Amino acid sequence: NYPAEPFRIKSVETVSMIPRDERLKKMQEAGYNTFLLNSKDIYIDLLTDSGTNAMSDKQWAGMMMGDEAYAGSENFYHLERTVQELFGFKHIVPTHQGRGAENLLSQLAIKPGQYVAGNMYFTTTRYHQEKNGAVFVDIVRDEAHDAGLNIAFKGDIDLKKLQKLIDEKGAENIAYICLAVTVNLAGGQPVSMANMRAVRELTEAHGIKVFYDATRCVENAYFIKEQEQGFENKSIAEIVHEMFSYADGCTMSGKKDCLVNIGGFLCMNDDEMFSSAKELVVVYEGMPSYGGLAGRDMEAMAIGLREAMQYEYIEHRVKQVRYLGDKLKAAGVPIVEPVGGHAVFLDARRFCEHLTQDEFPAQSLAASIYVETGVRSMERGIISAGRNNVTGEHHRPKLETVRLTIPRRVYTYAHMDVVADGIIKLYQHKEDIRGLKFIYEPKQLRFFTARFDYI
Amino acid sequence: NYPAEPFRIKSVETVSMIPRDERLKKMQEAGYNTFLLNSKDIYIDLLTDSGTNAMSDKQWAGMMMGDEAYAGSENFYHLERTVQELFGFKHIVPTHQGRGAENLLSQLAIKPGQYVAGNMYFTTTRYHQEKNGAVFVDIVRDEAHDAGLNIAFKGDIDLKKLQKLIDEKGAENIAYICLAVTVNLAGGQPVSMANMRAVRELTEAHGIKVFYDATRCVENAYFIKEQEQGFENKSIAEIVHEMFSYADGCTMSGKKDCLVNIGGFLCMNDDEMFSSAKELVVVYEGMPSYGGLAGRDMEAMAIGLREAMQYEYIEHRVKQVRYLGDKLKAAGVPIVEPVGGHAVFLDARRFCEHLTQDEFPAQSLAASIYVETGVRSMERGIISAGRNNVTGEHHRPKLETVRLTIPRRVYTYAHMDVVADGIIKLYQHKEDIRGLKFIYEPKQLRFFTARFDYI
Amino acid sequence: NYPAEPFRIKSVETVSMIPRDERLKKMQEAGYNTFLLNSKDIYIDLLTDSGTNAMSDKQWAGMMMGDEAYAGSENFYHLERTVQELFGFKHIVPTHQGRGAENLLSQLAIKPGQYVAGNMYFTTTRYHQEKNGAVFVDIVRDEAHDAGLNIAFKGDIDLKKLQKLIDEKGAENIAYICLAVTVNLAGGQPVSMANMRAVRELTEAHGIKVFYDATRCVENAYFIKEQEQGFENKSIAEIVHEMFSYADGCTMSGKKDCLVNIGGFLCMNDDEMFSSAKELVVVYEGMPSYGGLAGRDMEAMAIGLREAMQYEYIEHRVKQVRYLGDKLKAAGVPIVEPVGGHAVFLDARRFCEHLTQDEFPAQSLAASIYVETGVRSMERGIISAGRNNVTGEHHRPKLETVRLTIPRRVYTYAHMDVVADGIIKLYQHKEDIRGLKFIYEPKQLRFFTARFDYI
Amino acid sequence: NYPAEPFRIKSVETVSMIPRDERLKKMQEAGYNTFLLNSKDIYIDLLTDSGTNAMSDKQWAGMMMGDEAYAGSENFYHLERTVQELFGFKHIVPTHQGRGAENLLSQLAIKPGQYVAGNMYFTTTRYHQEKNGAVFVDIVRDEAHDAGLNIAFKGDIDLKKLQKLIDEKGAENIAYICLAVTVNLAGGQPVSMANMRAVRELTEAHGIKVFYDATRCVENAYFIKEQEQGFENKSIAEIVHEMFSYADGCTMSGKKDCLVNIGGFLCMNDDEMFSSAKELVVVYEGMPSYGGLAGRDMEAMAIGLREAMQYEYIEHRVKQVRYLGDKLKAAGVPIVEPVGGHAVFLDARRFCEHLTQDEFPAQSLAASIYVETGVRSMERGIISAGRNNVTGEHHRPKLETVRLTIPRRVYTYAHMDVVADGIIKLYQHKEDIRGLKFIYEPKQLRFFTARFDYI
Numbered sequence A, B, C, D: 001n002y003p004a005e006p007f008r009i010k011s012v013e014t015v016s017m018i019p020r021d022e023r024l025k026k027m028q029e030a031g032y033n034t035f036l037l038n039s040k041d042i043y044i045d046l047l048t049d050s051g052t053n054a055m056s057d058k059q060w061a062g063m064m065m066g067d068e069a070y071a072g073s074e075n076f077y078h079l080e081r082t083v084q085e086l087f088g089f090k091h092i093v094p095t096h097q098g099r100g101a102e103n104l105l106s107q108l109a110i111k112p113g114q115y116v117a118g119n120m121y122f123t124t125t126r127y128h129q130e131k132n133g134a135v136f137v138d139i140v141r142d143e144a145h146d147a148g149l150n151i152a153f154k155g156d157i158d159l160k161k162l163q164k165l166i167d168e169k170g171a172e173n174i175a176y177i178c179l180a181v182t183v184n185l186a187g188g189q190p191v192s193m194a195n196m197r198a199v200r201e202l203t204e205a206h207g208i209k210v211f212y213d214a215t216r217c218v219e220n221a222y223f224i225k226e227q228e229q230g231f232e233n234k235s236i237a238e239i240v241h242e243m244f245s246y247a248d249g250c251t252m253s254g255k256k257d258c259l260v261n262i263g264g265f266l267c268m269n270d271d272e273m274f275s276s277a278k279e280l281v282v283v284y285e286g287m288p289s290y291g292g293l294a295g296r297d298m299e300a301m302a303i304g305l306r307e308a309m310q311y312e313y314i315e316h317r318v319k320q321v322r323y324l325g326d327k328l329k330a331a332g333v334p335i336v337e338p339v340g341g342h343a344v345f346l347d348a349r350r351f352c353e354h355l356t357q358d359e360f361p362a363q364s365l366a367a368s369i370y371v372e373t374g375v376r377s378m379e380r381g382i383i384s385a386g387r388n389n390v391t392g393e394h395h396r397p398k399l400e401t402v403r404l405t406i407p408r409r410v411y412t413y414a415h416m417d418v419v420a421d422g423i424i425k426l427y428q429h430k431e432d433i434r435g436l437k438f439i440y441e442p443k444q445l446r447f448f449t450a451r452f453d454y455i
């Protein structure tokens, strides 16, 4: 139901709240973009679960054994064998974080004019696909875009859609299939093993490569153990190893499920791709033997990935998120269902039904939540979706959401109650939330530093 | 009612989640004595609040700045000015922990045959008084000995007993009044500011010295802020400083309210005594400027004592313990009342009223609690009382209790639920709890290494 | 002559002391390529001064205060004001290390077909310039290419070459002047303040921008204090600030002169460029307020850059390298002159004049040095130069060298003796050094993984 | 001859010097007692090698795995088995440092009226012997008191003197033999294995117990390997294990040869003594399961004791001291010979032959060395020797020395040169050093806080 933390607290950092009118000042100073608030002016920081995790005593012991050598570091060897063992891939190239590996994959595996197909888009991923000359095709099933629809494994690829893509475009014009676990923008929704196996069989028969976005693969494995028939007695590690046996490689932002504050990598089975990846890694990241990471960080990430395989750890991680979701839902607050692995997503269309999606309800709601509570959350809606690179119009995602994203091992159920209590009160006067409009818009990944003014 | 943690987690400590059946085997291998359990086999360790506290990020930063010089360390000067500022004593001598400071005080301040009077007593404190030739006299209010009596400031000294001691023995034959805040043996009960002032004035008129056992002075200050009228507008720090203005000095276990794992100190206002204390500290502890502590530890203790002044921190510390007591009591589980600053004491006599004291109900209840929940608690009953080696009979204490002792900043309300729910479930079939018999009993310190089996 | 270390040791790093016979086996298992040695098998690792620096106690304290927020981290603001104060640039964008900042600069500041001119070049820097469409032009003084010429400020730009470039191509077709301090490829040679000013004035009159590669700017400032007249009364910090007042911005590898294991940044004065840089940093690195670094690492870099301003620190850093060069040279061992800020380069062509370049004298000398002393050095000769894949011929560089690269604050003069004495002993029977032949050669990055055997 | 450091520097702490007249001020403010100077006013701190050692990366990794439990800590178990394995004793009781264990031993093993016999006195040791009712008898051979006499194993007990003590006093009036390795006050002089074996045989035949002071046992083992015939091929660990096979237990200040900043212990073979020691440890130090130490400190000390067994580490440690000695001797500076394991001792009788021992030449010289160099050193002469507890006169040691004591793994040969250069210059005008007299004298261990004025 709701287990207690399967760990003790080793050290703490203080949290405080500043008055509402200070927060009012700060929200306008930040152009009503939560990304532009300062860390010290935030009481509970749920902007993202990326890089904000609490490390363990063992990882910190690893941090003291940083072998900082340029090549041949013990830390690189430990990371390399851990990832080979746990994920089952032949080769690994470390990168400083996820988008570093996406930069490598996209340059390596895409010829201009080709299609990349994925189970829903992601921001940095789609940007790197498109700047290397690819058209992104969404092949997640329709249901994944229906916020309130409570079905299991919403992250699953629609096989019918993949078949269609192959018939219409021809297999040789498909660069690869991008399969993310979990699917972040659908609300952290898992992909079933049955689906990964079917995708593999179908792509293999046409000679098409499959690369996983491994960023939240452990959360995903937890959902498989919990809900997919025949997996209830398998270990998280067994499930993780089987997942990747259906892929040709993966990108990974270790800043999520490897339980670290920095770090990532690219894996692949193909020797020639590994060669080419090492050539490129030196341009952007570092030598293949550290990839833009300190030795101590390769060590922390090797230790953290293995810790993530502990059943009680990942069960608690996921059920803590589910608790926040359960509380919000019992009070009538509209959310994406079912609750995903890493965050609760308020459905901004419903929270603010008096605004149109063109008035940026999600961006607005996130600002309002900050002003009323000091809790920081992130826009995951029309602003994040960016512009159509052909028409210049906003991409218009059906999912217009605001994310309360939970860092791993950082907060308690009492913090979840405080967050829930605040959101619930904002709900009582949701009609008070105003439309926003751009006053400054970056040319790509605009959500990061865009500024707004009230309409 | 109960506040959320006024901090978040910076790092975690790894623990074992072994299941009940395996816990039963560890309990058996430990001869049903919780003092013999391995730390690595315990989920939640409530054996003691001494030196088991979680430090902050700021303390851990000070841990990296240990000036390890044998004399004149910068860390000692930081510690020194912090305690002068916050306690308002003229002089300070660091010691490795509390009983090191007690050793010094009792040697400095007692002539053979003299009396030391206090509000109840603690084992190490009273030991050092007696081996320097003092006779102990309990001058706590009589209410403190009624363990079920729910009244405020139960730790207060009975001014009439103090007067009576003075009239009967003479002021010149009283070494000092030892006033402890809070009072451990009464279950962590606080002492009021009015009481501290009344005692200062009576003792001062007769030339008698007063030394505080300041080990949980911050918990004590929280009770005064919360319950003593006139202190609603005072900061914890103002209250702490006023408390000590009524003393000639103090002994301190930093391992409790200074939020550290090791450390303590001795304070006094008198120049001549400070001189004598520096002559003696070098005998047992170290220099006046390290006192048996590493430089990093004087630094962590200087930083920890200042953090302990934060209202929200100590409010949450005391209310978290109170939460555990309230929950037990609402289900009819018998406890010492009112709940103290640092622990909850189960009344094992009443909990296991089908067992006689000779069947060690507290020792047996402590073993049951570990088996059922992974929680370690401390026996504080007939076993810890020891055996009269002259007559061979048990010392038979009036309190037959299990102590649930709460380290600062280590656990959450969900851990408190694990503890409460498990004890509550045992309470519902309390008649099934079995008596214990010795299978190995040493001559001394029997509570530390004795082994038992079920009757 | 040579100052003592202006610091003492706070903690040590454990190394293997394996004997010569065992070192011969590790060298053989590594195919006689020092780049393939395991860090755990190396006594003294002079492969590189990049990211291998020892941090202080203060830096390690900042490592405990990482504010890991995704945006608005306190550590970023500390880094930001430190670089503004010390470099005197208006704006700063952090990057995970140097080549991340170079990626950004070259994309922001180059239109296809434009020229970038600099005092020699570095591989990553020049790569990013060229892939954004620039043509590189070397405008260093001709003396810089005479590797045995013992003159001051060998890194200076030839103003006449700059003028000639301007006259021939037009100012509008020059993207920027890339001025590096120190100049790595000339062996770590400094650039004078007069040169920096002369270049600022000529470029400014034509509207041309100047960006510094500031990677070893502090070593450079030490040379100006020591050798450029008029700077005897200036602090290292005054000199560093004046250097940058002659630039429009810079790229920085903190892994060199900021005394850290990871980290770098981009600076500029121009508001519009700062805006564009923040639009791009999110593509490859992270937010304008972490740039692909953990919060603790921005903190360590802010603290390290300020420590690097201490005169005694940088004096000792540069004179320790000089000590190694002086000792080699006094025994007749041929080196690049004068000795630079960060390394000594052995002339392997002259050292092994019984071998032809096709027998890889630098690669072989590097292997010998490890076998005889436990010291790892880097090949910087025909092997690192790579192979023309069009014609299949070696690129044949004029410099056939072994680089003895000195990390900051890691080694003592006795380690420098181990290195010198071992090289000196090899020099005395240099004729016994054997040529190498490939037994495995990859198509690219051949210096990283190639294996050899003796001829 | 002089090996290089068999480790790299992992982190540093800054050192600086203040002007001579600031130092002049500071020396008089400190009553001309070097113990009373502040750490931050000292440039190179050679007061003592106790607790001032640099820890390794592995020890600091152990520091992150502090298991702070009150009983059953993993850290206590690791310390316990390491000491059982390496020293060979049956039982261990941790204490916060050396004099804590001496306090226990003296209370446990001495009946009033009995004699304790040792190879030369030590300050805290003799004080704890005498306050428990023992007469100290020196049975080191005469030669150990002759400063300039260069003979091997000066720490050896004179068997003739031990035999005499037994005949004159009777074996049952001898509490135990105290055998220290090395002998600190003779200048850090080693004891031979032959001598330890002869002492064991002779004491065993009379039923007399032998307890070692293990504080510098690893330095001692190094001297045996280097100089005692038949031990040249034994490992340091084998030699350490054999040493202790001749003892009934030991006291240990881990702050020396266990390479830590705090910590110690008491070992013994006898079960009944172990029982009694645990009873006493709770009075002064803590529970037998932590002994006044944080878990992380038991861990660091377990790791450090094992590191100390590495041949190259202890060889370098000892030869670095020998280098300082060689330099001083080549210049004609008078020292204790041969040079011991941990410090060079200037012979103050010879350095200041114009003063009498009653004018405290050693105390004076130490002050002078500070004023001229900023180097701190310690009095080891008439002041340290204390007063005869029968006559009230100063004990008058023949050895009137000033100690330049080297912390482990903290300084370099260049620091040793700076120290040597300074001492050598002070020597040129040694006639300038003035007599001192007490203005304040503590009643015991007076050297710690005594203050003086020039005669």
Ligand SMILES: CC1=C(O)/C(=C\N=C(/C)C(=O)O)C(COP(=O)(O)O)=CN1
Binding pocket: A047, A048, A049, A050, A097, A098, A099, A100, A122, A124, A125, A180, A184, A213, A215, A216, A252, A253, A254, A255, A264
């Ligand atoms: C599924 C997925 C992500 O969610 C992702 C970054 N997402 C963030 C930081 C988030 O807040 O969701 C990235 C990019 O990783 P990076 O932030 O560059 O380490 C890749 N995959």
Ligand SMILES: CC1=C(O)/C(=C\N=C(/C)C(=O)O)C(COP(=O)(O)O)=CN1
Binding pocket: D047, D048, D049, D050, D097, D098, D099, D100, D122, D124, D125, D180, D184, D213, D215, D216, D252, D253, D254, D255, D264
């Ligand atoms: C041989 C020996 C010592 O040298 C010693 C303390 N000596 C110090 C601190 C010194 O500076 O020599 C002690 C007392 O240890 P302690 O400083 O209490 O950990 C015991 N034995």
Ligand SMILES: *Cc1c(COP(=O)(O)O)cnc(C)c1O
Binding pocket: B050, B097, B098, B099, B100, B122, B124, B125, B180, B184, B213, B215, B252, B253, B254, B255, B264
């Ligand atoms: C624990 C305690 C002490 C002793 O302090 P230590 O640091 O354990 O020696 C003294 N007084 C009270 C009231 C205590 O609880």
Ligand SMILES: *Cc1c(COP(=O)(O)O)cnc(C)c1O
Binding pocket: C050, C097, C098, C099, C100, C122, C124, C125, C180, C184, C213, C215, C252, C253, C254, C255, C264
């Ligand atoms: C090492 C170096 C760089 C690159 O920095 P990284 O942090 O290695 O990417 C750039 N310029 C010079 C002169 C360098 O030496």
Ligand SMILES: [K+]
Binding pocket: A050, A051, A052, A261, A262, C068, C069, C070, C293, C294, C295
């Ligand atoms: K982070």
Ligand SMILES: [K+]
Binding pocket: B050, B051, B052, B261, B262, D068, D069, D293, D294, D295
């Ligand atoms: K502890």
Ligand SMILES: [K+]
Binding pocket: A068, A069, A293, A294, A295, C050, C051, C052, C261, C262
């Ligand atoms: K590094």
Ligand SMILES: [K+]
Binding pocket: B068, B069, B070, B293, B294, B295, D050, D051, D052, D261, D262
């Ligand atoms: K110390």
